[PDB]
């Protein structure tokens, strides 16, 4: 007679954390389809409200995306891997981020996370994670003291929305995941 406990091994690697909330988890039938991904977002939004969603840190590693809570760091709310990521996109709003991962053979899950202000830096990391290296902070900002002002032309549209839109348009379908038979003759 003697007690005994076992524990896993801690994995420490250059990973970035993003402050976001946790809406919930909604299962999907298809791996792709903006009509399906967005159909899971509202579903969760309806159940729990904005304030109902707990604050959690979204840890996105090189080729992995782990969800850790704020109350604790060892708390793994959801363990997603870019390799499993079948399809990822943004909801009608640029302040929401939902991605569909593979949790088995055909059954896939779709988690959502509220990004503040928007999901420009987030959706940018996850999407870039598929390829590998990410650019991140561009650096080039707004000077302030303009010289020639008084004519129509260069718009004042931020490069943040220009992208956030694309995501909610065509989205990003992980290539690595090619087990289906959608190859045209």
Curated annotation (Swiss-Prot):
It comes from the Eukaryota. Disruption phenotype: Knockout mice develop cataracts from 16 months of age with defects such as ulcer-like anomalies in the cornea, and opacity in the lens cortex or wider lens. Decreased muscle strength, however clasping ability is unaffected. Impaired spatial memory retrieval and learning. Reduced branching of hippocampal neurites and increased fragmentation of neuromuscular junctions. APBB1 and APBB2 double knockout mice show progressive retinal lens disruption from 1 month of age, morphologically lenses show massive vacuolization, lens capsule rupture and disruption of the lens fiber cells organization. It is found in: Endoplasmic reticulum; Golgi apparatus; Early endosome. Expressed in the brain, retinal lens and muscle cells (at protein level). Residues 12-130 form the PID domain. Plays a role in the maintenance of lens transparency, and may also play a role in muscle cell strength. Involved in hippocampal neurite branching and neuromuscular junction formation, as a result plays a role in spatial memory functioning. Activates transcription of APP. Interacts (via C-terminus) with APP (via C-terminus). Interacts with APLP2 (via cytoplasmic domain). This is Amyloid beta precursor protein binding family B member 2. It comes from Mus musculus. The chain holds residues 582 to 704 of 760 of the full protein.
């Amino acid at each position: 007679g003697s007690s005994g406990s076992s524990g896993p091994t801690p994995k420490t690697e250059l990973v970035q954390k993003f402050r976001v909330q946790y809406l919930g988890m909604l299962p999907v039938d298809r791996p792709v389809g903006m009509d399906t991904l967005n159909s899971a977002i509202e579903n969760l939004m309806t159940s729990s409200s904005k304030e109902d969603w707990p604050s959690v840190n979204m840890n996105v590693a090189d080729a992995t995306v782990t969800v850790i809570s704020e109350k604790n760091e060892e708390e793994v709310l959801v363990e997603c891997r870019v390799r499993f990521l079948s399809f990822m996109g943004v909801g009608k709003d640029v302040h929401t981020f939902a991605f569909i991962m593979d949790t088995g053979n055909q059954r896939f899950e779709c988690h959502v996370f509220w990004c503040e202000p928007n999901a420009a830096n987030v959706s940018e990391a996850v999407q870039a994670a598929c390829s590998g290296p990410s650019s991140g902070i561009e650096g080039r900002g707004s000077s302030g003291s303009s010289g020639s002002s008084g004519s129509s032309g260069d718009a004042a549209v931020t490069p943040e929305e220009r992208h956030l839109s694309k995501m909610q348009q065509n989205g990003y379908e992980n290539p690595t995941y090619k087990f289906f038979e959608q190859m045209q003759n």
